[PDB]
Motif scaffolding. Sequence first.
Motif, PDB file in Angstrom:
ATOM      1  N   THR A  49       2.949 -34.272 -10.068  1.00 28.59           N
ATOM      2  CA  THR A  49       3.090 -35.163 -11.213  1.00 28.59           C
ATOM      3  C   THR A  49       4.141 -34.663 -12.195  1.00 28.59           C
ATOM      4  O   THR A  49       4.763 -35.472 -12.889  1.00 28.59           O
ATOM      5  N   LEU A  50       4.363 -33.347 -12.258  1.00 25.03           N
ATOM      6  CA  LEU A  50       5.432 -32.827 -13.105  1.00 25.03           C
ATOM      7  C   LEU A  50       6.778 -33.431 -12.716  1.00 25.03           C
ATOM      8  O   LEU A  50       7.542 -33.884 -13.573  1.00 25.03           O
ATOM      9  N   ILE A  51       7.091 -33.433 -11.420  1.00 25.65           N
ATOM     10  CA  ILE A  51       8.376 -33.975 -10.987  1.00 25.65           C
ATOM     11  C   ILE A  51       8.374 -35.493 -11.044  1.00 25.65           C
ATOM     12  O   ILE A  51       9.399 -36.107 -11.352  1.00 25.65           O
ATOM     13  N   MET A  52       7.231 -36.128 -10.772  1.00 25.47           N
ATOM     14  CA  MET A  52       7.160 -37.574 -10.938  1.00 25.47           C
ATOM     15  C   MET A  52       7.502 -37.984 -12.362  1.00 25.47           C
ATOM     16  O   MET A  52       8.144 -39.018 -12.580  1.00 25.47           O
ATOM     17  N   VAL A  91      15.073 -28.446   4.177  1.00 26.94           N
ATOM     18  CA  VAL A  91      15.270 -29.435   3.120  1.00 26.94           C
ATOM     19  C   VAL A  91      15.715 -28.762   1.828  1.00 26.94           C
ATOM     20  O   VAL A  91      16.621 -29.245   1.141  1.00 26.94           O
ATOM     21  N   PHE A  92      15.079 -27.644   1.480  1.00 18.10           N
ATOM     22  CA  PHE A  92      15.438 -26.903   0.275  1.00 18.10           C
ATOM     23  C   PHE A  92      16.910 -26.494   0.287  1.00 18.10           C
ATOM     24  O   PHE A  92      17.633 -26.703  -0.694  1.00 18.10           O
ATOM     25  N   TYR A  93      17.383 -25.931   1.401  1.00 17.51           N
ATOM     26  CA  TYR A  93      18.766 -25.461   1.451  1.00 17.51           C
ATOM     27  C   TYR A  93      19.753 -26.621   1.454  1.00 17.51           C
ATOM     28  O   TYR A  93      20.833 -26.530   0.850  1.00 17.51           O
ATOM     29  N   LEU A  94      19.426 -27.708   2.159  1.00 13.65           N
ATOM     30  CA  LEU A  94      20.320 -28.862   2.176  1.00 13.65           C
ATOM     31  C   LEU A  94      20.377 -29.537   0.811  1.00 13.65           C
ATOM     32  O   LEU A  94      21.441 -30.008   0.391  1.00 13.65           O
ATOM     33  N   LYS A  95      19.248 -29.586   0.099  1.00 14.15           N
ATOM     34  CA  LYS A  95      19.265 -30.045  -1.286  1.00 14.15           C
ATOM     35  C   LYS A  95      20.192 -29.178  -2.129  1.00 14.15           C
ATOM     36  O   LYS A  95      21.005 -29.690  -2.905  1.00 14.15           O
ATOM     37  N   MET A  96      20.086 -27.854  -1.981  1.00 15.75           N
ATOM     38  CA  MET A  96      20.959 -26.951  -2.724  1.00 15.75           C
ATOM     39  C   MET A  96      22.424 -27.199  -2.389  1.00 15.75           C
ATOM     40  O   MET A  96      23.280 -27.191  -3.280  1.00 15.75           O
ATOM     41  N   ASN A 138       5.331 -33.985  -1.765  1.00 23.25           N
ATOM     42  CA  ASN A 138       5.841 -32.625  -1.654  1.00 23.25           C
ATOM     43  C   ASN A 138       6.862 -32.366  -2.753  1.00 23.25           C
ATOM     44  O   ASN A 138       7.820 -33.142  -2.903  1.00 23.25           O
ATOM     45  N   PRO A 139       6.698 -31.308  -3.565  1.00 20.34           N
ATOM     46  CA  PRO A 139       7.640 -31.080  -4.672  1.00 20.34           C
ATOM     47  C   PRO A 139       9.098 -30.950  -4.256  1.00 20.34           C
ATOM     48  O   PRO A 139       9.980 -31.356  -5.024  1.00 20.34           O
ATOM     49  N   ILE A 140       9.385 -30.379  -3.085  1.00 16.59           N
ATOM     50  CA  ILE A 140      10.770 -30.299  -2.626  1.00 16.59           C
ATOM     51  C   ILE A 140      11.310 -31.693  -2.343  1.00 16.59           C
ATOM     52  O   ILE A 140      12.424 -32.043  -2.747  1.00 16.59           O
ATOM     53  N   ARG A 141      10.517 -32.517  -1.655  1.00 18.12           N
ATOM     54  CA  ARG A 141      10.923 -33.895  -1.397  1.00 18.12           C
ATOM     55  C   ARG A 141      11.153 -34.638  -2.704  1.00 18.12           C
ATOM     56  O   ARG A 141      12.141 -35.370  -2.850  1.00 18.12           O
ATOM     57  N   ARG A 151      13.316 -17.945  -1.817  1.00 21.82           N
ATOM     58  CA  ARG A 151      14.155 -19.125  -2.005  1.00 21.82           C
ATOM     59  C   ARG A 151      14.086 -19.605  -3.446  1.00 21.82           C
ATOM     60  O   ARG A 151      15.107 -19.994  -4.028  1.00 21.82           O
ATOM     61  N   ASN A 152      12.896 -19.566  -4.048  1.00 24.71           N
ATOM     62  CA  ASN A 152      12.759 -19.966  -5.447  1.00 24.71           C
ATOM     63  C   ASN A 152      13.569 -19.058  -6.360  1.00 24.71           C
ATOM     64  O   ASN A 152      14.235 -19.531  -7.288  1.00 24.71           O
ATOM     65  N   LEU A 153      13.527 -17.747  -6.113  1.00 20.21           N
ATOM     66  CA  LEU A 153      14.304 -16.830  -6.941  1.00 20.21           C
ATOM     67  C   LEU A 153      15.798 -17.105  -6.824  1.00 20.21           C
ATOM     68  O   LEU A 153      16.524 -17.084  -7.826  1.00 20.21           O
ATOM     69  N   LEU A 154      16.282 -17.330  -5.605  1.00 19.33           N
ATOM     70  CA  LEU A 154      17.690 -17.660  -5.408  1.00 19.33           C
ATOM     71  C   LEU A 154      18.060 -18.917  -6.181  1.00 19.33           C
ATOM     72  O   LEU A 154      19.094 -18.971  -6.865  1.00 19.33           O
ATOM     73  N   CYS A 155      17.214 -19.944  -6.077  1.00 24.88           N
ATOM     74  CA  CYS A 155      17.469 -21.212  -6.741  1.00 24.88           C
ATOM     75  C   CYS A 155      17.509 -21.044  -8.253  1.00 24.88           C
ATOM     76  O   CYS A 155      18.434 -21.531  -8.914  1.00 24.88           O
ATOM     77  N   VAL A 156      16.499 -20.376  -8.816  1.00 28.54           N
ATOM     78  CA  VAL A 156      16.405 -20.210 -10.265  1.00 28.54           C
ATOM     79  C   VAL A 156      17.608 -19.449 -10.797  1.00 28.54           C
ATOM     80  O   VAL A 156      18.189 -19.806 -11.833  1.00 28.54           O
ATOM     81  N   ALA A 157      18.005 -18.389 -10.098  1.00 30.44           N
ATOM     82  CA  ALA A 157      19.100 -17.561 -10.579  1.00 30.44           C
ATOM     83  C   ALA A 157      20.386 -18.372 -10.698  1.00 30.44           C
ATOM     84  O   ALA A 157      21.015 -18.426 -11.765  1.00 30.44           O
ATOM     85  N   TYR A 158      20.795 -19.021  -9.609  1.00 28.54           N
ATOM     86  CA  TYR A 158      22.056 -19.752  -9.634  1.00 28.54           C
ATOM     87  C   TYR A 158      21.972 -21.013 -10.485  1.00 28.54           C
ATOM     88  O   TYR A 158      22.963 -21.382 -11.122  1.00 28.54           O
ATOM     89  N   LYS A 159      20.808 -21.665 -10.542  1.00 27.87           N
ATOM     90  CA  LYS A 159      20.656 -22.833 -11.408  1.00 27.87           C
ATOM     91  C   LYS A 159      20.948 -22.471 -12.857  1.00 27.87           C
ATOM     92  O   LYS A 159      21.627 -23.219 -13.574  1.00 27.87           O
ATOM     93  N   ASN A 160      20.443 -21.323 -13.307  1.00 34.40           N
ATOM     94  CA  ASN A 160      20.672 -20.896 -14.678  1.00 34.40           C
ATOM     95  C   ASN A 160      22.123 -20.503 -14.899  1.00 34.40           C
ATOM     96  O   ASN A 160      22.709 -20.849 -15.930  1.00 34.40           O
ATOM     97  N   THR A 162      17.341 -33.151 -13.627  1.00 40.43           N
ATOM     98  CA  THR A 162      17.454 -32.643 -12.260  1.00 40.43           C
ATOM     99  C   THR A 162      16.669 -31.343 -12.184  1.00 40.43           C
ATOM    100  O   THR A 162      16.415 -30.706 -13.219  1.00 40.43           O
ATOM    101  N   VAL A 163      16.267 -30.949 -10.979  1.00 44.41           N
ATOM    102  CA  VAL A 163      15.532 -29.700 -10.775  1.00 44.41           C
ATOM    103  C   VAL A 163      16.144 -28.839  -9.686  1.00 44.41           C
ATOM    104  O   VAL A 163      16.978 -29.284  -8.890  1.00 44.41           O
TER     105      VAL A 163
HETATM  106  S1  LIG Z   1      15.546 -23.585  -8.966  1.00 43.53           S
HETATM  107  C1  LIG Z   1      13.830 -23.903  -8.546  1.00 43.53           C
HETATM  108  C2  LIG Z   1      13.399 -24.865  -9.623  1.00 43.53           C
HETATM  109  C3  LIG Z   1      12.384 -24.189 -10.522  1.00 43.53           C
HETATM  110  N1  LIG Z   1      11.164 -24.956 -10.475  1.00 43.53           N
HETATM  111  C4  LIG Z   1      11.129 -26.194 -10.949  1.00 43.53           C
HETATM  112  O1  LIG Z   1      11.974 -26.655 -11.700  1.00 43.53           O
HETATM  113  C5  LIG Z   1       9.950 -27.024 -10.513  1.00 43.53           C
HETATM  114  C6  LIG Z   1       8.737 -26.438 -11.212  1.00 43.53           C
HETATM  115  C7  LIG Z   1      10.140 -28.478 -10.929  1.00 43.53           C
HETATM  116  O2  LIG Z   1       9.710 -26.924  -9.100  1.00 43.53           O
HETATM  117  C8  LIG Z   1      10.575 -27.267  -8.081  1.00 43.53           C
HETATM  118  C9  LIG Z   1      10.074 -27.351  -6.787  1.00 43.53           C
HETATM  119  C10 LIG Z   1      10.916 -27.681  -5.730  1.00 43.53           C
HETATM  120  C11 LIG Z   1      12.266 -27.921  -5.968  1.00 43.53           C
HETATM  121 CL1  LIG Z   1      13.371 -28.341  -4.623  1.00 43.53          CL
HETATM  122  C12 LIG Z   1      12.775 -27.834  -7.251  1.00 43.53           C
HETATM  123  C13 LIG Z   1      11.930 -27.510  -8.296  1.00 43.53           C
END
Ligand SMILES: *SCCCNC(=O)C(C)(C)Oc1ccc(Cl)cc1
Lengths: 5, 5, 236, 236
Positions: free
Chosen positions: C222-225, C123-128, C171-174, C46-55, A4-5
């Motif tokens: 392709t990374l996410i694929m 989409v990003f926030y609803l995914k979160m 789209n990487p978010i999609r 948004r990326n910083l918020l996501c990375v912080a809480y994901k970790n 998951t990402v």
């Molecule tokens: S918490 C944000 C994730 C950190 N980045 C990633 O894991 C990669 C590089 C796969 O990029 C994305 C891009 C978009 C989303 Cl919704 C999640 C990860």
Amino acid sequence: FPATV
Amino acid sequence: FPATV
Amino acid sequence: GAMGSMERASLIQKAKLAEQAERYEDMAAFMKGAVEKGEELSNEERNLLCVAYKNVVGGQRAAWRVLSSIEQKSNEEGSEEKGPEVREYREKVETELQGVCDTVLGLLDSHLIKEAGDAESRVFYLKMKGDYYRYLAEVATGDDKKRIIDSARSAYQEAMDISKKEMPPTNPIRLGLALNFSVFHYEIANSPEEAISLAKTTFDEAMADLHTLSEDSYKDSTLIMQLLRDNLTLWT
Amino acid sequence: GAMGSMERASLIQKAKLAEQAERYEDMAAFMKGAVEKGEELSNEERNLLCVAYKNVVGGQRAAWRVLSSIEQKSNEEGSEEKGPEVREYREKVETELQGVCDTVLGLLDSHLIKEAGDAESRVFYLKMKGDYYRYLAEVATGDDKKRIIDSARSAYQEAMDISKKEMPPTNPIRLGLALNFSVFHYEIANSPEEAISLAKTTFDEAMADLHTLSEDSYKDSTLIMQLLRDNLTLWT
Ligand SMILES: *SCCCNC(=O)C(C)(C)Oc1ccc(Cl)cc1
Ligand SMILES: *SCCCNC(=O)C(C)(C)Oc1ccc(Cl)cc1
Ligand SMILES: [Mg+2]
Ligand SMILES: [Mg+2]
Ligand SMILES: [Mg+2]
Ligand SMILES: [Mg+2]
């Protein structure tokens, strides 16, 4: 676990 | 850094 | 809030420093403070918020799984009674994990989602929202477990609907949304066929759109694929 | 203290669970609670205390070094002024690190060291006192920096004196004490020759005593001897 990402 | 335990 | 006196820009700067120092709890606290300033977040923020809480939540989930496995074994036949300590400590970690999820969901509800109008933010926030309800579902066992699962499903589904209408299939978010919703189907909703179908269709539709992309966008998609392919290999 | 209501044995059990879950802050809090019960610690319990705080402070030190390096570069010629944030955040991490060191030193002073009569416990605690003063010295820049360094030296020296009289040259505590005091000389006291001499003499005297050991004791001693050799290779 599966990826998951 | 050097090793410590 | 303890970050109320710090400038928004300083909170963002310190979140980036905390990331470099691998201090993800600090990073999350700084980003929570930034969100609470009330302004919308940029893509980078948004990326910083996501990375912080994901970790943060990722570490809690890993610890919860270790403790849950120990607790499971302690309840098998022939195991010695060791007292309430394993359950207590698993519950302690679980409660902290739920607290983090509730905090993230609270930031999304007050008021990130309602102000998010562009597809990239909404989409990003609803995914979160789907992700953090999914983490709550991983530990849920009570009267509201079905409602927790349905809250995750509903958020993912709204994100999916917007992403299909408003974003290209690469789209990487999609893509990341589809990856995670597929995992939701497999691991939470007892729907491995839906998980597999979603991963395969997402992968194939992205493949067909790669020709439109620059080299850098191609790398991102392709990374996410490859993660979708990894899960398909695990599941088939 | 928040652990005052939990049984000593339950605190120890949960410290072991926390270690398995890689929850070292929890592990340290449980072991602090165990120490505060007022009873002496067994060999295994001393190890749990050591492992917990070593991991906590090790993460803080790694983060402090990242931030200090960023701060150093921000003060070089031609660097853009980015405001007080780097210094502030380095100071925040530094203050938390100092808090952990003060907590460990407080447990040693109240009252682990004064009740430790056997060499295995007393040398271990005095080594720990030297280590945590050394971590304070790594970040110190003020009026008391020389006194902090001398506090580390004095604790290490008392541990060294006891260990030479009361332990064989292969004892892992004696070896680890010498390893760390040697690092103190090299990195803190600006005494690389003393660091090298101590590491070499410790290694050689342990080598000459290996013949007395069982296979399992040999494994324990040679592991730390290899660290002495690693440092000697780094320094020569
Ligand atoms: S918490 C944000 C994730 C950190 N980045 C990633 O894991 C990669 C590089 C796969 O990029 C994305 C891009 C978009 C989303 Cl919704 C999640 C990860
Ligand atoms: S914090 C206790 C250190 C964990 N164990 C170790 O690192 C090894 C296996 C090297 O053992 C010792 C033994 C004695 C001391 Cl004083 C330090 C480490
Ligand atoms: Mg303003
Ligand atoms: Mg619970
Ligand atoms: Mg009693
Ligand atoms: Mg300071």
